[PDB]
Design a protein around this ligand. Structure first.
Ligand SMILES: *C(=O)[C@H](CCSC)NC=O
Lengths: 46, 271
RNA sequence: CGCGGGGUGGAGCAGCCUGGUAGCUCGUCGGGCUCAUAACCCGAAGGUCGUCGGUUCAAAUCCGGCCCCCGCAACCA
RNA sequence: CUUUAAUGUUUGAUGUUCUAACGUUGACCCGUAAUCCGGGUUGCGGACAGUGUCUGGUGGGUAGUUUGACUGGGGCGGUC
RNA sequence: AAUUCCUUGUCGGGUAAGUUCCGACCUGCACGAAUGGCGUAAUGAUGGCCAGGCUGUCUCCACCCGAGACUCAGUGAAAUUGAACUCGCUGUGAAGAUGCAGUGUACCCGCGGCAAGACGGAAAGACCCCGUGAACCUUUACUAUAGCUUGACACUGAACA
RNA sequence: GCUCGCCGGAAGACCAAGGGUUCCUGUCCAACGUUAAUCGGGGCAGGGUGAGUCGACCCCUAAGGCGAGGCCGAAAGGCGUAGUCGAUGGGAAACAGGUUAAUAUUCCUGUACUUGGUGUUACUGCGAAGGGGGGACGGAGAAGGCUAUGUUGGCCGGGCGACGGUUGUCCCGGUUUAAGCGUGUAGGCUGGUUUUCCAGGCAAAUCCGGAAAAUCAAGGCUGAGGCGUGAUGACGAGGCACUACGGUGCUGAAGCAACAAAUGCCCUGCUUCCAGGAAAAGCCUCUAAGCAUCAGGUAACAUCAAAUCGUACCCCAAACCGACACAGGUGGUCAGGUAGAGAAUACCAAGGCGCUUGAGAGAACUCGGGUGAAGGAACUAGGCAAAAUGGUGCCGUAACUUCGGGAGAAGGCACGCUGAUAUGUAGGUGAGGUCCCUCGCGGAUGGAGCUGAAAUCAGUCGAAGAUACCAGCUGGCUGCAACUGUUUAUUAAAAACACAGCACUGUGCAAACACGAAAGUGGACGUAUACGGUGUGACGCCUGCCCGGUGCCGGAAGGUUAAU
RNA sequence: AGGACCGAACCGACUAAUGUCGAAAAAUUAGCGGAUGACUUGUGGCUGGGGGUGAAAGGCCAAUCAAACCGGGAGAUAGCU
RNA sequence: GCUUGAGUCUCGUAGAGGGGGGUAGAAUUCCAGGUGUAGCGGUGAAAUGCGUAGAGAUCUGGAGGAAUACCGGUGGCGAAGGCGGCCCCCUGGACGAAGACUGACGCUCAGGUGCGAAAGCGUGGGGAGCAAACAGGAUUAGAUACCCUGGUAGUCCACGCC
């Protein structure tokens, strides 16, 4: 077999990145919401 | 040459490698090349537009001139060259003024042959001439549609276009597919017939052959379930509908000749 | 358990659909041409239109019972 | 009234030519080193093609749903 | 016959014994000529039958070597469970009874075992039906629609035959 | 600490990735470890990661992303040019030894190397988003030459040994050495050089490309390893000396020959084959707009700078992913001895572990296996499971056939050990000596030494010699499918799908078709010997009859027929 | 030369047993199939929900598929329990 | 040794001898247009078919594939099969003339080799006409035959097999 969460920080930051979300239309509203709930970790990173 | 390989292993028993002993045994003219990354049949959106295209060997594109826009300049075909793109093995020609180029190779054209591009050239296999001064009733190839487009017809191996007649300003042509079309006399036709005619005798014997060329397998419609193809389903291949394209459009008898901006060109449609 | 169509000289079909007139091939009897049969040519006879009742000037026809026949039924955990 | 005939006149259907609309994934030049694009010369077609609107046909490629009940279980048959 | 319902069809071969198998006979319920027919060496973790070899598969198992099972010390679950002083039998009974009646039997209570019952435990039966429930799928089910296609008006003009 | 046992192409040693202090030290035992625990990857506390040469950042690009104007779209927004990002890619430069509780191609010692800045002196013309060469490349295969490395011997050091022999053809340990520089071989590639001219490379050109002349036959490019240097240096067995009894200081012999031999290197080679095998920059160089008492470039030299981030530890697993300290999965590199063809396997070296519950008992039964009387498929849905065959050379081998095969068909013989042929052969390698010389890493010749198949003969041991691990069961009739292959991951691996070939049909290029409201793309920078769709499915022999019904195509006179 | 044979690393997953509250939410054990190819694989990109992909099973799309997951319509509706 | 066998060289003759590459004319068919109109075609007769969507007939142009009227002759060449419009190129065999030259070098030949009408078969093109099978209409006691109308393979070309 092969479990389904391979660890790769690049892909962790390529399509879940602060600069990745803040880029497009939908992404900003998402970041708006996580701030809207008051969550500390918006999109996990370093 | 229809050189059949002996039946050693299964699959190898039906191979016909029409090899050639007249090409250059070596890597071609480096300056006349450029990369060519296949996109596998996908558009900008990324969705598979055309099926059966994926995988395959990497190829390098040789920029071949079809226009022949150099009047009155002698050239010599130094060596032939195998082409990963065409069926017509291109020929490396050296113009006598110090500039090498690639062009399709005619019938009996060999290494070291002299040619010339223009209205001044007489008749000999490989010479290119603005159609008017060509013997009405000859055989040509690489004819341009738009005088300056470059080259449009009969560019594959063993193909040729017969020039019917020049009535008025439009040349009556005859394609291999029998569709006689009128094109102005302003175009440029290269005399002769495209070489390497034994290309259509070449069989690939194995299944892996068509795959390393680049063609992905074709999944028949009587095998696909109704959800993925118009035909399909049934216990024992219960076929019984009318043959259509996987998108509903009826096939095996359906003229999709929907142009109308060029019917003034086509004189006699496919016989 | 039903629906659909039909039942017409010795064989089999026309005509029915849209009401006043019943036809064709073979066959039967026979003659002819042939030394003989067949084949063919030709003429005639042969049809209660399955049966009964109703209806209108006239019922093979339009309608209603009974009988006979073909296809499908004779099931699935 | 009908058969017809010259003309004035009012619209329509074809044939052909022309050039300014338009098309131009023809050549070339400039912006500009830039296969995008725009414009300018010229060539090739040509009032077509294409697009909007109205409209006839086709149309499971696609979509919204219907697809009766009783029934000595359902179904078949039958009935309402 | 991957097809033959009737059927283990019929004759022959193999076996002492052949509903399978092999070869033929055609009476093909209901083969069939690119939804291809008939053969086909080679290939096959393919389907079926047969012989040899070899063996515990079996006639009938037996012994032995280890890992658990058993005991002791430490740690310590689980599904399940209305309450329980929780026997068999005959009968009756919401229709197969540990619980009612009749009746025999039975000191109280553990452990190692084995699985007949508690219609045992696990899955608000996947089987059938119902619901004027849902969902995909088919088409000559009803109505629309993309696209394609016809023509007219417009962008769209000017001459003559 | 002394014995025993296990892996040893790993259960060993290092990295990427990814985790994030799990690394080391001291201390503590409740909670975590499926047991206890003064133990630990647990708690508390302290310490550790040192760089011009490693990776990355950085220069430059690929698939692809974003993308000022632009084309287009109800809006959002989509695609795309110039540009600008993006490695798994290409591009400059270092090795050995010693040390710490933990880190070191980074610290220290020694020995080296690279790209740039300013300055000095002597010469010389330099100069782009522009051109050219290079960079720069495929698969498989055979061969020559070496190295990492192993072994034997020689030599040095020690012993001659608790039960019989052991001063001898005896035994044990060591015998290690790079980067750079110089030389520049084996080998491979290519004819150099000089003159002139030119519609060629958007322009220029001395650079490249081309055509005629000329002289001579080599010059040049490239290149593992060896040899010298590096190094009268480092290291080095065993001793010499103090114990906090963990280890430290000091001293220091030999340090070579020979054979065998890689998948490593020469080789980003050579032959052959076809499915025809990146791009850009660094680098070398030519000129443009121009600038020349200049500025710059070349060469030698002095000095200076080389930043920032990561660097601990795990890294085929108790530290990653799987909720766990989980019999699973995880890319790359190094990878010894004997037998053996081998990275198989078995036993071992270096090195690391005994799997974090054990002590007794030997009951049924379960599980993993060993063995068996006579028979040998009578078992059963069915030869499922086990059992058996199993290696090398040679002999021999049918029906059938597409003449490749079938085939390792089936069935058989010889296999250990010792000596002799021959103080170990054929073969391979090969120093000294000798000769020559266009003198070097030379060419012949010469044969010491070393390594080492196999065949025959004789004798002998045992029941057995591929004695173990390792390691086909074979054949006959036949359906289906051609075959290799693919598939329902987590109940179906086949007769299903794919398949080369075949057939029809659509398509004249702004091609049909397809994604997309559009633009723009794929099709294809392909064009009828091409591309798309459908159907069957190698090969061989063939592939019949029906156009009523449906669909499609052609012909449209006429009837019906919307909008207007 | 080879979609060549035997057969490890590598990858896949035909048989039987054990396991099924397991060591493991499909593994191990002893044998198999392929292994120069239509091969396998690391790093990294593109195609997305009525859509993707598919050597085509209605399989696969984060242990979930004849139409994914999450949030909003929504306290949806139920002649039903 | 010789020559009356056989062979060869010098100069000429006839010829559908073979292969390869072009070219020419009439006729048939088809496509398009002009003119024009109820029949055309076929047969012993008739019908199928074709035609008022306008054929046939007729005129013009164009694209075609195949075979070569007359010359043509119990004429010619070749081993036989077989081969004829004309031209070019390569090329074979037979024959005549006056001499010379080598000097029996010959005849046939199982096995063996090659060539080899048509038809048929494979790969890839070509495809006008003609035309198995096949279909329709007739004939016929029946007609899967003779007739007619349409018509696929083939017939033709390059490389092979039989
Ligand atoms: C019939 O016995 C039924 C068939 C079920 S097939 C899924 N079996 C049980 O209900």
């Amino acid at each position: 077999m092969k479990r389904t969460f391979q660890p790769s920080v690049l892909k962790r930051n390529r399509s879940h990145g602060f600069r990745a979300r803040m880029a497009t239309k939908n992404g900003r509203q998402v970041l708006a919401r996580r701030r809207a709930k008051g969550r500390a970790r918006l999109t996990v990173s370093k | 040459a229809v050189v059949k390989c002996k039946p050693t292993s299964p699959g190898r028993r039906h191979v016909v490698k029409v090899v050639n002993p007249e090409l250059h045994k070596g890597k071609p003219f480096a300056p006349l090349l450029e990369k060519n990354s296949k996109s596998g049949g996908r558009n900008n959106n990324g969705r598979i537009t055309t099926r059966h295209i994926g995988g395959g060997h990497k190829q390098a594109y040789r920029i071949v001139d079809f226009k022949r826009n150099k009047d009155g300049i002698p050239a010599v075909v130094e060596r032939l060259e195998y082409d990963p793109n065409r069926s017509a093995n291109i020929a490396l020609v050296l113009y006598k003024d110090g500039e090498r180029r690639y062009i399709l190779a005619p019938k009996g054209l060999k290494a070291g042959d002299q040619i010339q591009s223009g209205v001044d050239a007489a008749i000999k296999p490989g010479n290119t001439l603005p159609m008017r001064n060509i013997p009405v009733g000859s055989t040509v190839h690489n004819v341009e549609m738009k005088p300056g487009k470059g080259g449009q017809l009969a560019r594959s191996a063993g193909t040729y276009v017969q020039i019917v007649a020049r009535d008025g300003a439009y040349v009556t042509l005859r394609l291999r597919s029998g569709e006689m079309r009128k094109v102005e006399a302003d175009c440029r036709a290269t005399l002769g017939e495209v070489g390497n005619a034994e290309h259509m005798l070449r069989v690939l014997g194995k299944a892996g052959a068509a795959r390393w060329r680049g063609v992905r397998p074709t999944v028949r419609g009587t095998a696909m379930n109704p959800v993925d193809h118009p035909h399909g389903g049934g216990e024992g291949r219960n076929f019984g509908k009318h043959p259509v394209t996987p998108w509903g459009v009826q096939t095996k008898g359906k003229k999709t000749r929907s142009n109308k901006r060029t019917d003034k060109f086509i004189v006699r449609r496919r016989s």
